[PDB]
Design a protein around this motif. Structure first.
Motif, PDB file in Angstrom:
ATOM      1  N   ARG A 164      21.627  -8.260  -7.545  1.00 37.74           N
ATOM      2  CA  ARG A 164      21.927  -6.863  -7.280  1.00 37.74           C
ATOM      3  C   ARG A 164      20.822  -5.971  -7.843  1.00 37.74           C
ATOM      4  NH1 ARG A 164      24.894  -2.280  -8.197  1.00 37.74           N
ATOM      5  NH2 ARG A 164      26.296  -1.706  -6.466  1.00 37.74           N
ATOM      6  N   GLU A 165      20.313  -6.318  -9.024  1.00 34.28           N
ATOM      7  CA  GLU A 165      19.249  -5.541  -9.656  1.00 34.28           C
ATOM      8  C   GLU A 165      17.957  -5.523  -8.840  1.00 34.28           C
ATOM      9  OE1 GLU A 165      17.502  -6.977 -13.438  1.00 34.28           O
ATOM     10  OE2 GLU A 165      17.418  -4.863 -14.042  1.00 34.28           O
ATOM     11  N   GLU A 166      17.503  -6.697  -8.410  1.00 33.56           N
ATOM     12  CA  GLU A 166      16.283  -6.816  -7.612  1.00 33.56           C
ATOM     13  C   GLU A 166      16.318  -5.888  -6.397  1.00 33.56           C
ATOM     14  OE1 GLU A 166      16.379 -11.025  -6.834  1.00 33.56           O
ATOM     15  OE2 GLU A 166      15.152 -11.502  -8.588  1.00 33.56           O
ATOM     16  N   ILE A 167      17.513  -5.705  -5.846  1.00 32.12           N
ATOM     17  CA  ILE A 167      17.711  -4.842  -4.694  1.00 32.12           C
ATOM     18  C   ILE A 167      17.798  -3.380  -5.124  1.00 32.12           C
ATOM     19  CG2 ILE A 167      19.142  -4.344  -2.694  1.00 32.12           C
ATOM     20  CD1 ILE A 167      20.250  -7.163  -2.909  1.00 32.12           C
ATOM     21  N   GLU A 168      18.407  -3.133  -6.279  1.00 31.15           N
ATOM     22  CA  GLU A 168      18.547  -1.769  -6.777  1.00 31.15           C
ATOM     23  C   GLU A 168      17.204  -1.139  -7.102  1.00 31.15           C
ATOM     24  OE1 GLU A 168      21.833  -2.487  -9.840  1.00 31.15           O
ATOM     25  OE2 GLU A 168      22.547  -0.600  -8.964  1.00 31.15           O
ATOM     26  N   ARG A 169      16.423  -1.798  -7.955  1.00 35.32           N
ATOM     27  CA  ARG A 169      15.129  -1.260  -8.363  1.00 35.32           C
ATOM     28  C   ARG A 169      14.205  -0.873  -7.213  1.00 35.32           C
ATOM     29  NH1 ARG A 169      12.884  -6.497 -11.806  1.00 35.32           N
ATOM     30  NH2 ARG A 169      12.376  -7.910 -10.074  1.00 35.32           N
ATOM     31  N   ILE A 170      14.154  -1.704  -6.180  1.00 36.07           N
ATOM     32  CA  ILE A 170      13.293  -1.409  -5.051  1.00 36.07           C
ATOM     33  C   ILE A 170      13.819  -0.230  -4.243  1.00 36.07           C
ATOM     34  CG2 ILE A 170      14.348  -3.119  -3.482  1.00 36.07           C
ATOM     35  CD1 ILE A 170      11.653  -3.478  -2.199  1.00 36.07           C
ATOM     36  N   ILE A 171      15.096  -0.258  -3.872  1.00 40.35           N
ATOM     37  CA  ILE A 171      15.641   0.838  -3.086  1.00 40.35           C
ATOM     38  C   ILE A 171      15.528   2.155  -3.838  1.00 40.35           C
ATOM     39  CG2 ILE A 171      17.600   1.751  -1.789  1.00 40.35           C
ATOM     40  CD1 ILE A 171      18.513  -0.988  -1.210  1.00 40.35           C
ATOM     41  N   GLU A 172      15.459   2.081  -5.161  1.00 41.56           N
ATOM     42  CA  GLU A 172      15.320   3.287  -5.967  1.00 41.56           C
ATOM     43  C   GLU A 172      13.920   3.851  -5.748  1.00 41.56           C
ATOM     44  N   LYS A 173      12.902   3.023  -5.998  1.00 41.58           N
ATOM     45  CA  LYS A 173      11.506   3.434  -5.840  1.00 41.58           C
ATOM     46  C   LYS A 173      11.271   3.945  -4.419  1.00 41.58           C
ATOM     47  CE  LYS A 173       8.029   4.140  -8.420  1.00 41.58           C
ATOM     48  NZ  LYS A 173       6.902   3.216  -8.702  1.00 41.58           N
ATOM     49  N   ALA A 174      11.884   3.285  -3.444  1.00 44.14           N
ATOM     50  CA  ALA A 174      11.748   3.700  -2.060  1.00 44.14           C
ATOM     51  C   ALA A 174      12.170   5.163  -1.934  1.00 44.14           C
ATOM     52  CB  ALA A 174      12.602   2.822  -1.161  1.00 44.14           C
ATOM     53  N   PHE A 175      13.350   5.489  -2.457  1.00 45.63           N
ATOM     54  CA  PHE A 175      13.872   6.854  -2.402  1.00 45.63           C
ATOM     55  C   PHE A 175      12.932   7.843  -3.048  1.00 45.63           C
ATOM     56  CE2 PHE A 175      18.016   5.285  -1.106  1.00 45.63           C
ATOM     57  CZ  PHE A 175      18.439   6.331  -0.290  1.00 45.63           C
ATOM     58  N   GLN A 176      12.495   7.515  -4.256  1.00 47.65           N
ATOM     59  CA  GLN A 176      11.585   8.369  -5.003  1.00 47.65           C
ATOM     60  C   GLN A 176      10.290   8.617  -4.231  1.00 47.65           C
ATOM     61  OE1 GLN A 176      12.587   7.636  -9.615  1.00 47.65           O
ATOM     62  NE2 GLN A 176      11.539   5.888  -8.684  1.00 47.65           N
ATOM     63  N   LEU A 177       9.867   7.635  -3.443  1.00 45.24           N
ATOM     64  CA  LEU A 177       8.653   7.770  -2.646  1.00 45.24           C
ATOM     65  C   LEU A 177       8.905   8.719  -1.488  1.00 45.24           C
ATOM     66  CD1 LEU A 177       7.366   4.117  -2.525  1.00 45.24           C
ATOM     67  CD2 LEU A 177       6.784   5.947  -4.125  1.00 45.24           C
ATOM     68  N   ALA A 178       9.909   8.410  -0.676  1.00 40.84           N
ATOM     69  CA  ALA A 178      10.249   9.244   0.469  1.00 40.84           C
ATOM     70  C   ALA A 178      10.460  10.681   0.028  1.00 40.84           C
ATOM     71  CB  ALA A 178      11.499   8.722   1.150  1.00 40.84           C
ATOM     72  N   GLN A 179      10.881  10.849  -1.220  1.00 41.69           N
ATOM     73  CA  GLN A 179      11.131  12.167  -1.775  1.00 41.69           C
ATOM     74  C   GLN A 179       9.859  12.996  -1.926  1.00 41.69           C
ATOM     75  OE1 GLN A 179      13.023  12.673  -5.833  1.00 41.69           O
ATOM     76  NE2 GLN A 179      14.728  13.258  -4.505  1.00 41.69           N
ATOM     77  N   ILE A 180       8.738  12.345  -2.224  1.00 40.12           N
ATOM     78  CA  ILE A 180       7.469  13.059  -2.380  1.00 40.12           C
ATOM     79  C   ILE A 180       6.672  13.091  -1.070  1.00 40.12           C
ATOM     80  CG2 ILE A 180       7.443  12.207  -4.745  1.00 40.12           C
ATOM     81  CD1 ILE A 180       5.012  10.579  -4.094  1.00 40.12           C
ATOM     82  N   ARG A 181       7.264  12.531  -0.020  1.00 41.27           N
ATOM     83  CA  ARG A 181       6.639  12.501   1.292  1.00 41.27           C
ATOM     84  C   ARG A 181       7.485  13.368   2.236  1.00 41.27           C
ATOM     85  NH1 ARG A 181       5.422   8.222   4.159  1.00 41.27           N
ATOM     86  NH2 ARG A 181       3.275   8.938   4.476  1.00 41.27           N
ATOM     87  N   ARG A 182       7.822  12.877   3.422  1.00 44.41           N
ATOM     88  CA  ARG A 182       8.607  13.679   4.356  1.00 44.41           C
ATOM     89  C   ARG A 182      10.117  13.551   4.184  1.00 44.41           C
ATOM     90  NH1 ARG A 182       7.051  11.721   9.546  1.00 44.41           N
ATOM     91  NH2 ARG A 182       5.607  10.191   8.622  1.00 44.41           N
ATOM     92  N   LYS A 183      10.526  13.004   3.044  1.00 46.76           N
ATOM     93  CA  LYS A 183      11.931  12.812   2.722  1.00 46.76           C
ATOM     94  C   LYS A 183      12.750  12.181   3.843  1.00 46.76           C
ATOM     95  CE  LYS A 183      11.851  16.649  -0.530  1.00 46.76           C
ATOM     96  NZ  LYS A 183      12.210  15.900  -1.765  1.00 46.76           N
ATOM     97  N   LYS A 184      12.319  11.003   4.280  1.00 50.70           N
ATOM     98  CA  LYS A 184      12.999  10.244   5.330  1.00 50.70           C
ATOM     99  C   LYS A 184      12.822   8.767   5.004  1.00 50.70           C
ATOM    100  CE  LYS A 184      12.535  10.970   9.633  1.00 50.70           C
ATOM    101  NZ  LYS A 184      11.877  11.102  10.966  1.00 50.70           N
TER     102      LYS A 184
END
Lengths: 357, 356
Positions: A164-184
């Motif tokens: 569950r953690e391996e999946i959590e950490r990545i999906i988190e970073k993904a969000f944080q990235l999309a957040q500084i881009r076009r938020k999608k």
């Protein structure tokens, strides 16, 4: 403000493109009063020649102390007779694991003067500006058991295993990235069949509540496949597992025609990361001055953004690169519109010029 | 010759497109004394109504006594809100399982008139003519354990399982198909990591010996991924396991801009096979005379080629299709050169008209 960058040139064109990058990097920082420190360490064949190992202890010490790490490329025929553990590549993968990097970013942007090289019609590849995030740690790749049975080897199996953690950490970073881009963000999986996928999709949904500004969309790997061909313009940020990511990453590479000048980043939970160009060392072009520094430079750009939040600074490099290509300059490999061939050094000099404009 | 064929029109535009296939089929078969024996049957939603089950046992018997089975499509709004066991799709899945069809053969080729619409630049997509053979029975799709292990189920797993036989048969079939085509087989895998792939390549290599007249190549799924974009024309017959083939199949669908007239076929170790167009049921389109029969018509030609070996007959159908498209005709879904939209019956009429 202050930043200690671990620099690891490597083998082949590695050093060439690194110098080019550092130059560009230096100017940009100077123009805004930033103070940076560059400690050079060995890795790959060089390190092997000077310390017997592709990833010497000193190099790790430097990396751990550094704010981020810039890498060129490793590889060469000189070391091709050594056992896997004593080869360039090993030092690279080693370094990645030791630093605990789980996320791999592979951006793909469309460059107007490069569309003629795109396998797709202009109308589609035009506007492409996505980043694919891949799970580096777990997956069907590292999951055990992987074996045959029978007897007589009548049965074989491989295991897709995620925590569950391996999946959590990545999906988190993904969000944080999309957040500084076009938020999608597009969570790609195979939730219709894989249970691992179902867990992934759930967690995607959960983490979403934490980032209400980012639009979460869910796509099945197979659909994304078609979509990367018939409508890659829709994607901003795409997060996905190891096996699927590996595939999609490669697919997206060819679409813009920018392969050869593609950068990458291997991030983790915090602001640390290792940035390096996708291209290899290409020892044949070593010294000849045809080494294409664009990839590595764009890497340095990713570094500034993802590891230091220096957007303004990052955009400078990105523009320079764009403009120079807009002017038709390249080191020979890229098929730019109206071919204006220069050397590694000149194309670099050009980038700097555009910066002090 | 004589050939008994199960005709499962299914539901939605299914019966509409299925008609055209039958007409054309008859037009072609009556060229050199061919007794075409058709026997209609129910499946999917239609069956659910007049039988209570998506797959009536009657239909199975019909199938079991047929040389090959032609199919339309299944699905509809009506049955989508009932329980999973009474969903039209399972009828299809079941039938496929009952007939033991393991290989999914899905061809993709370029059609000049659609070249402007392709996502790839003309020079690349032009001349494309490949077939992806996908394994249907095993793999990561049907393999346990597939649960969330504790503590707190904070661990999950899925299993990719294959048996030596499941692989041997898919590859032998692939070889045999290449032999009737351009004699070039590309075995695709991830043999540098997956032990199943490692075993796959081993077997692929061994089978090659029995078919010395076929050029075998081993590509990693990922490379094959970008190759379908950068140089799809290099391929002839591609073969791979479930998961991989599911993806690649979908990828190759759009490259030529013909997705919508693409036919598929599920075969097994023998001449028996099930042939169906790749498109869905399209209920909202049903009855309005705007369904595209080409997909099913092509499926019919594949049937003649792969089940009955009637190559000249299949050839004629495919030619007819091209020519119609050549004259810029379709029903509206396709984007032909100098496009002219006509009705399903109309195109079919032209197809036949060209067919002689």
């Amino acid at each position: 403000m202050k930043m200690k960058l671990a620099v690891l040139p490597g083998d082949g064109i590695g050093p060439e493109v690194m110098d080019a990058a550092i130059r560009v990097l230096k100017t940009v920082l100077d123009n805004d009063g930033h103070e940076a420190v560059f400690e050079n360490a060995l890795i790959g064949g060089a390190a092997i020649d000077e310390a017997g190992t592709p990833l010497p202890e000193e190099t790790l010490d430097i990396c751990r102390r550094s704010d981020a790490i810039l890498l060129g490329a490793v590889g060469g025929p000189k070391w091709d007779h050594n056992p896997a553990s004593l080869r360039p590549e090993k030092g690279l993968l080693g370094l990645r694991k030791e630093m605990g990097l789980f996320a791999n970013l592979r951006p793909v942007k469309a460059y107007a003067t490069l569309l003629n090289a795109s396998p797709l019609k202009r109308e589609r590849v035009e506007n492409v500006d996505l980043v694919i995030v891949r799970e580096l740690t777990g997956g069907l790749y590292f999951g055990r058991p992987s074996e045959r049975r029978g007897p007589g080897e009548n049965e074989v199996v491989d295991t897709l295993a995620y925590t569950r953690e391996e999946i959590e950490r990545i999906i988190e970073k993904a969000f944080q990235l999309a957040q500084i881009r076009r938020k999608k963000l597009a969570s790609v999986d195979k939730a219709n069949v894989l249970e691992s996928s179902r867990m992934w999709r759930e967690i995607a949904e959960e983490t979403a509540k934490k980032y209400p500004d980012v639009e979460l969309s869910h796509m099945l790997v197979d659909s994304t496949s078609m979509q990367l061909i018939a409508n890659p313009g829709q994607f901003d940020v795409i997060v996905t597992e190891n096996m699927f990511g590996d595939i999609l990453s490669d697919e997206a590479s060819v679409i813009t025609g920018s392969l050869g000048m593609l950068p990458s980043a291997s991030l983790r939970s915090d602001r640390f990361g290792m940035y390096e160009p996708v291209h290899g060392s290409a020892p044949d072009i070593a010294g000849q001055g045809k080494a294409n520094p664009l990839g590595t430079v764009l890497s340095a750009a990713l570094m500034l953004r993802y590891s230091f939040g220096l957007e303004k600074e990052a955009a400078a490099i990105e523009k320079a690169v764009d403009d120079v290509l807009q002017d038709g300059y390249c080191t020979g490999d890229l098929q730019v519109a109206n071919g204006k061939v220069v050397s590694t050094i000149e194309l670099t000099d050009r980038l700097i010029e555009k910066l002090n404009n």
